[PDB]
Amino acid sequence: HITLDIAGQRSTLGIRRLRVQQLINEIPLAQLELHIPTDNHGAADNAVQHEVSRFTLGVRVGIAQDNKPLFDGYLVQKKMQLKGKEWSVRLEARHALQKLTFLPHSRVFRQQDDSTVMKGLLQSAGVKLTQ
Amino acid sequence: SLLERGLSKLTLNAWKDREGKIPAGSMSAMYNPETIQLDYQTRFDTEDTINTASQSNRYVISEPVGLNLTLLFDSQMPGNTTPIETQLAMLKSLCAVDAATGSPYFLRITWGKMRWENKGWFAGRARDLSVTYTLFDRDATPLRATVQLSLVADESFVIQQSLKTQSAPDRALVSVPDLASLPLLALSAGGVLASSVDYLSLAWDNDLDNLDDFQTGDFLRAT
Amino acid sequence: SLLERGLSKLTLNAWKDREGKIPAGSMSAMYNPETIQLDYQTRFDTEDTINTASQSNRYVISEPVGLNLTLLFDSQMPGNTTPIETQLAMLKSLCAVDAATGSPYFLRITWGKMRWENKGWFAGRARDLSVTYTLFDRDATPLRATVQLSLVADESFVIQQSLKTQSAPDRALVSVPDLASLPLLALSAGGVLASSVDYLSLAWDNDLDNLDDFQTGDFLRATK
Amino acid sequence: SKHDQLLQFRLSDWQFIRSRLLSTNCWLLPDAASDTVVIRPLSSRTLARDSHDYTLYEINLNFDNRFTPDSLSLQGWDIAAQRLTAAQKSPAGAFRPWKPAGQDYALAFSM
Numbered sequence: 001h002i003t004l005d006i007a008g009q010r011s012t013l014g015i016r017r018l019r020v021q022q023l024i025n026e027i028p029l030a031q032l033e034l035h036i037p038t039d040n041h042g043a044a045d046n047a048v049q050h051e052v053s054r055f056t057l058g059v060r061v062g063i064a065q066d067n068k069p070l071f072d073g074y075l076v077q078k079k080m081q082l083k084g085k086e087w088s089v090r091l092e093a094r095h096a097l098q099k100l101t102f103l104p105h106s107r108v109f110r111q112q113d114d115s116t117v118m119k120g121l122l123q124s125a126g127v128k129l130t131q
Numbered sequence: 132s133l134l135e136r137g138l139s140k141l142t143l144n145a146w147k148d149r150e151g152k153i154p155a156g157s158m159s160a161m162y163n164p165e166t167i168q169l170d171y172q173t174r175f176d177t178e179d180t181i182n183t184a185s186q187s188n189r190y191v192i193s194e195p196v197g198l199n200l201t202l203l204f205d206s207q208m209p210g211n212t213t214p215i216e217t218q219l220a221m222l223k224s225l226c227a228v229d230a231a232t233g234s235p236y237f238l239r240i241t242w243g244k245m246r247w248e249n250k251g252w253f254a255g256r257a258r259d260l261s262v263t264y265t266l267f268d269r270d271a272t273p274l275r276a277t278v279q280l281s282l283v284a285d286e287s288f289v290i291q292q293s294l295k296t297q298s299a300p301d302r303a304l305v306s307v308p309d310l311a312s313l314p315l316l317a318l319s320a321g322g323v324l325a326s327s328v329d330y331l332s333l334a335w336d337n338d339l340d341n342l343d344d345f346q347t348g349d350f351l352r353a354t
Numbered sequence: 355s356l357l358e359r360g361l362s363k364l365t366l367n368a369w370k371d372r373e374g375k376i377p378a379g380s381m382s383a384m385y386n387p388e389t390i391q392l393d394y395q396t397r398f399d400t401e402d403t404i405n406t407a408s409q410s411n412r413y414v415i416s417e418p419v420g421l422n423l424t425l426l427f428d429s430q431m432p433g434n435t436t437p438i439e440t441q442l443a444m445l446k447s448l449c450a451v452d453a454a455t456g457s458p459y460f461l462r463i464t465w466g467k468m469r470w471e472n473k474g475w476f477a478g479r480a481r482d483l484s485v486t487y488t489l490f491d492r493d494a495t496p497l498r499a500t501v502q503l504s505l506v507a508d509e510s511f512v513i514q515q516s517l518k519t520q521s522a523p524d525r526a527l528v529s530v531p532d533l534a535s536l537p538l539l540a541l542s543a544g545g546v547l548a549s550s551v552d553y554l555s556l557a558w559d560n561d562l563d564n565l566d567d568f569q570t571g572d573f574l575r576a577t578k
Numbered sequence: 579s580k581h582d583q584l585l586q587f588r589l590s591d592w593q594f595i596r597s598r599l600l601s602t603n604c605w606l607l608p609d610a611a612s613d614t615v616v617i618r619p620l621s622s623r624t625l626a627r628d629s630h631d632y633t634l635y636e637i638n639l640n641f642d643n644r645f646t647p648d649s650l651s652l653q654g655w656d657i658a659a660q661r662l663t664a665a666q667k668s669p670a671g672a673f674r675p676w677k678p679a680g681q682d683y684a685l686a687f688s689m
Contacts, residue, residue, distance in 0.1 A: 001183075002181055002182055003182070012182075012183075013182075014180035014183065015180060015181050016178075016179050016181070018181060035180075035189075037178070037187070037189070038457075039190035039457045039458075040187070040371065040372035040457075041325060041370060041371045041372075041376075041457060042327060042370070042371025042373060042375055042376060043327050043371070043373075044371075044372065044511070045327075045371075057642075057643040058643065076642065076644055077640065077641065077642045077643070077644070079639065079640050079641065080637075080639055081637075081638055082636065082637045082638075083635070083636040084191070084636075085189070085190055085191060086189070086191075099681075101644075102645055102681075103647070103681055103682070103683060103684075104683070132491065132492070132493065132495075136492050137492060138492055139492070139493050139494055163490070165488075166486060166488055167486070167487050168484060168485065168486035168487070169446075169484065169485050170483075170484040171449060171450065171482060171483035171484065172481075172482060173449075173450075173451075173479070173480060173481060173482070175481065175506060177415060177417065177418060179415065184514075185514050185515070186416070186418065186507070186509075187372075187508055187511075188418055188506060188507075188508055190458060190479075193450070193451050242494045244491070244493045244494055244495045245439070245487075245490075245494050245495070245496055246439045246443065248446060249446060292630070294453050295453040295454070297453070298452065298453035298454040299453070299454035318375070321376075322370075322377075325370055325376065325454045325455055
């Protein structure tokens with residue numbers, strides 16, 4: 001089935017929506033959507049509070065579909081709604097190319113190839129170029 | 132019974148605010164309704180998941196309890212001297228929009244020995260109403276009414292405050308039975324509070340020494 | 355029967371949590387319903403595929419089992435002495451939102467030998483309730499009730515996980531018959547697990563030598 | 579500190595203000611029902627689920643960390659000294675707008 005790993009633990013919750021997006025020149029992403037149950041009280045009413053509090057911004061998030069790796073990215077932008085008795089939370093997770101996108105750097109790159117500029121430029125996050 | 136035999140008509144008491152400080156008029160209905168019904172409705176929705184196969188459903192809202200009752204008025208039989216339009220002057224008035232305030236009149240219905248929703252009274256506002264006059268005379272002063280009231284819950288905000296004070300208070304004060312143990316003392320203390328108190332924090336609150344310092348007859352408090 | 359002829363009423367037990375840890379009140383109702391009814395329903399949606407090779411319809415969700423049940427209370431016949439408001443002060447309470455937590459009470463209906471959907475009890479919460487008093491007294495103690503309950507399925511998570519491990523608990527332990535073969539032994543192991551256990555993995559997991567190694571009475575272990 | 583030389587080069591005159599509030603560590607706080615504005619630098623009521631006084635209906639909160647750095651080490655070219663003035667790094671964790679109950683940005687200007 002579909003198993004959401006966050007920070008190494010398999011994190012038994014209930015996903016109502018999962019959508020993994022992957023394009024041709026863009027950072028691939030993955031939206032989750034969970035439901036935190038409120039109407040079933042007792043021991044599993046605060047034990048589900050412990051499982052959502054582990055969703056800090058920037059954690060290893062892994063999705064596995066039919067015992068194959070689906071997404072494997074870091075977490076950004078945890079939104080929660082809480083309308084009425086509903087209390088949903090929405091996750092997003094971005095690839096390792098998210099470490100490259102909002103910090104203005106400056107280099108020069110004299111006497112280098114087209115590939116040696118760029119494979120040393122993706123290497124700052126741990127992304128391994130294949131070419 | 133137990134004192135005397137005489138009819139207790141139902142009374143429609145109306146206020147202007149939720150709490151009942153400002154009183155409107157009141158009327159007692161002749162010809163008791165012969166049937167009342169209180170209808171409940173709690174709305175659920177089936178929760179969905181794509182990981183597991185556990186099947187539960189989500190509590191959405193609780194639609195309030197509605198009271199349906201019908202009344203009949205008559206001013207023809209020789210005991211009935213008062214006209215039915217001065218009696219229907221207040222069912223139409225107290226179950227409509229107030230003149231100065233936009234809200235209705237909060238309509239507290241009561242009967243002599245009948246508990247409605249675990250209380251002696253039934254608060255609420257009239258959702259709808261219908262008078263259908265079926266018999267007239269020569270100038271048509273009306274002679275029959277056939278009223279068809281229907282109400283909602285609308286308890287006061289204070290009454291609703293005290294009822295959740297008698298259920299799950301702030302402090303528990305659970306007892307200690309014979310052959311007791313802290314995993315079971317914190318299991319019955321977590322049933323009064325409905326908040327699952329741990330054995331370890333129940334032990335620190337009472338400052339007991341050895342996790343066995345209860346002596347079958349002393350009281351230890353949970354918070 | 356088989357011992358004696360006393361009746362067994364139905365009992366409505368209530369809790370507060372999903373499980374049975376925190377008991378609320380619990381009433382038994384006189385004057386049995388005469389008829390129960392539990393309706394199942396499963397929702398399907400038709401595939402409007404453009405390829406037009408096949409007609410089919412997907413499975414979306416199974417609606418929860420709902421139980422309908424109608425009761426009656428009466429206290430003026432001289433065997434009946436408890437006033438019916440004390441018996442309806444529990445149905446009106448247990449089929450409503452609790453003051454402690456702000457939720458329904460997770461009811462559980464039971465009858466002496468009646469077996470509900472596949473268990474000896476019917477868990478769930480109250481969707482609906484309507485009392486309609488028809489007779490009264492001079493001071494109007496009611497003394498006639500006609501209740502019209504309606505519930506949903508909502509079982510606990512420990513019972514639902516236990517029923518899942520009783521069907522395909524990820525090991526098979528398949529016996530071999532006389533005149534057997536591994537494509538047949540994979541179909542008989544792919545029915546215990548419902549996972550298409552792909553016969554080359556059977557001969558690797560059990561250390562077969564030559565794909566015909568089993569001898570008419572030995573077992574083969576199949577995981578996933 | 580007094581300015582030596584500002585310049586408003588054909589700005590809207592409101593465009594100039596909130597490009598000058600961004601460089602001064604202040605926000606506007608505009609008030610309706612008046613013409614009074616309290617400009618105050620970037621630096622409780624306790625609405626709770628249990629509390630009777632305020633009724634709640636929806637609480638959306640986004641919790642993003644894309645455009646939130648930790649440093650803002652900004653520096654610029656000193657004309658007199660020509661050292662490209664020492665890097666004034668700002669710590670994250672000062673001015674916390676969200677305080678819970680339970681990457682380094684760096685430019686250098688030629689000016």
